[PDB]
Ligand binder design. Structure first.
Ligand SMILES: CC[C@@H]([C@H](C)O)n1ncn(-c2ccc(N3CCN(c4ccc(OC[C@@H]5CO[C@@](Cn6cncn6)(c6ccc(F)cc6F)C5)cc4)CC3)cc2)c1=O
Ligand code: HEM
Length: 484
């Protein structure tokens, strides 16, 4: 009566890892139907306490700074991958402000600039890459698991870092990111640093990529032109001063960029991968977006005026599509807080011993039939003339709160929380809809793809983000054959 019911573990230290590791939303539901909303289950030595539904969103995201802590849970996943000093390798208050700094490059004025850039890179890929080669080919097959992470990393790189850094990638140093990218695996949670080639190439890579950003930060500064609020590198050059007057070192700034680049790239890659495969099973939907985009362009020329950020606003169908994939495949299937003081689940007789791991999964409610009718059908129409990414789209108090990076909703009690809530809330929400929006609109305008006498592959949950199975590929044709 004082603790949540810990459950059976197939092999004990191993715990429920396979059932949960194989499918969390299924595993969660099986327990719910005979224990209720909260229950514990052990995993890799660490036992896991879960709270399902909106109320579990409140108890976790809105937990006091003293009761839980995300630094503890994420430290080894990120630090060895990004670097020291920043993001979970520092007090919470340092993290909060590092958000404030970064947000200055994620504003409406930046976004208007980012869209043409982001589109321009996509068009580079359509031509130069073997997957498409639109200039010479009219048919094609694209492995979305290859293309999307490359398109996402090139688009993010160009928007947030600039054109000098995007030209540096055209080289072998591209490799260094593949090596650091491999370092970013849930295998870190338990194995942070081992002596085999993987971990060495990963530490080496980090230090060389950190140097690359340090040198560009250096020159961009001394050269003396950091004036346009061009990007994320500019905004950290001018804002990197904490409350107390302490100032981030340039290596620390460099590690933050790496953190944010890889952080944003993985999540956004999944979602673009997923709405390509899903849009491919239902090509009817692609033509909905295509008609809407052409009607917006108006009378002649494929586009009367190349599509802008403001225009991206006027396209509910594009935005509704992004909301549906984030519902059906929230890249982050489970979010953790390590418990630092015993917690008294209210409207309950439970204490969560200190030292347990607290797991919240908005994705469950997203996939849940208890909260969405026909939850496993890809139907973006369910968003009824409501294309907003977020608002207090659910109940309880939704008044505002400031944790040090801008005022944010107090109430997190919604079934749909793809970007989370509370202090660790995502700051990249609007950058994603822009980036993904531009990828989507650029894709349908030039290509019409399909899905090979089949339907969407089963998701793999064994990595950072929820990704598709190995033979994941779309077969494209051209909506207009002659353009160069
Ligand atoms: C079946 C055999 C079995 C045995 C074991 O072999 N087995 N096999 C396989 N598995 C297996 C494999 C994996 C798991 N994982 C459980 C834990 N999951 C996970 C996912 C995401 C996480 O997020 C980390 C942070 C959160 O915020 C981010 C992200 N972000 C938000 N916006 C942008 N980025 C962030 C923030 C800000 C930044 F600036 C940067 C950032 F990055 C980073 C944390 C944890 C992964 C799956 C479980 C089981 C097994 O159990
Ligand atoms: C669809 C794409 C994205 C999704 C679904 C997403 C989702 C989330 C979620 C759920 C969290 C909360 C994690 C937690 O509570 O522990 C989060 C945090 C965060 N995200 Fe994102 N994110 C996305 C893209 C981005 C991008 C593009 C950036 C940067 C440009 C970004 C930066 C962050 C940061 C800095 C945090 C805060 C980490 C913390 O407070 O501990 N995310 N994101």
């Amino acid at each position: 009566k004082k603790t949540p019911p810990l459950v059976f573990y197939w092999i004990p230290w191993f715990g429920s890892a396979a059932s949960y590791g194989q499918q969390p939303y299924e595993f969660f539901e099986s327990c719910r139907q005979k224990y209720g909303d909260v229950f514990s289950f052990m995993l890799l030595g660490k036992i896991m306490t879960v709270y399902l539904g909106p109320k579990g969103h409140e108890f976790v995201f809105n937990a006091k700074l003293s009761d839980v802590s995300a630094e503890e849970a994420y430290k080894h996943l990120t630090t060895p991958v990004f670097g020291t000093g920043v993001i979970y390798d520092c007090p919470n208050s340092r993290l909060m402000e590092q958000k404030k700094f970064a947000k200055f490059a994620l504003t409406t004025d930046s976004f208007k600039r980012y869209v043409p850039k982001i589109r321009e890179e996509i068009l580079n890929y359509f031509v130069t890459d073997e997957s498409f080669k639109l200039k010479e080919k009219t048919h094609g097959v694209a492995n979305v698991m290859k293309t999307q992470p490359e398109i996402t990393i090139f688009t993010a790189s160009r928007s947030l870092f600039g054109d000098e850094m995007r030209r540096i990638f055209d080289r072998s140093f591209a490799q260094l990111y593949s090596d650091l990218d491999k370092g970013f695996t849930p295998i870190n949670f338990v194995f942070p640093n081992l002596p085999l080639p993987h971990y060495w190439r990963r530490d080496a890579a980090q230090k060389k990529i950190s140097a690359t950003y340090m040198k560009e930060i250096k020159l961009r500064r001394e050269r003396g032109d950091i004036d346009p609020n061009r990007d994320l590198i500019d905004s950290l050059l001018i804002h990197s001063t904490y409350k107390d007057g302490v100032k981030m070192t340039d290596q620390e700034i460099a590690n933050l960029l790496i953190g944010i680049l890889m952080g944003g790239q993985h999540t956004s890659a999944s979602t673009s991968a997923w709405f390509l495969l899903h849009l491919g099973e239902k090509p009817h939907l692609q033509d909905v977006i295509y008609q809407e985009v052409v009607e917006l362009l108006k009378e002649k020329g494929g586009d009367l005026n190349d599509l802008t950020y403001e225009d991206l606003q006027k396209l509910p169908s594009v935005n509704n599509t992004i909301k549906e994939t984030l519902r059906m495949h929230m890249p982050l299937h489970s979010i953790f807080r390590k418990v630092t003081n015993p917690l008294r689940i209210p409207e309950t007789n439970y204490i969560v011993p200190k030292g347990h791991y607290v797991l919240v999964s908005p994705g469950y409610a997203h996939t849940s039939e208890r909260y969405f009718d026909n939850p496993e059908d890809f139907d973006p129409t369910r968003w009824d003339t409501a294309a907003a990414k977020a608002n207090s789209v659910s109940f309880n108090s939704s008044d505002e709160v400031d944790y040090g990076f801008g005022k944010v909703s107090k109430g997190v009690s919604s079934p749909y929380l793809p970007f989370g809530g509370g202090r660790h809330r995502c700051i990249g929400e609007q950058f994603a809809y822009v980036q993904l929006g531009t990828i989507l609109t650029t894709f349908v305008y030039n290509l019409r793809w399909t899905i090979d006498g089949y339907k969407v592959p089963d998701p793999d949950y064994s990595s950072m983000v929820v990704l598709p199975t190995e033979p994941a590929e779309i077969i494209w044709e051209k909506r207009e054959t002659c353009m160069f």
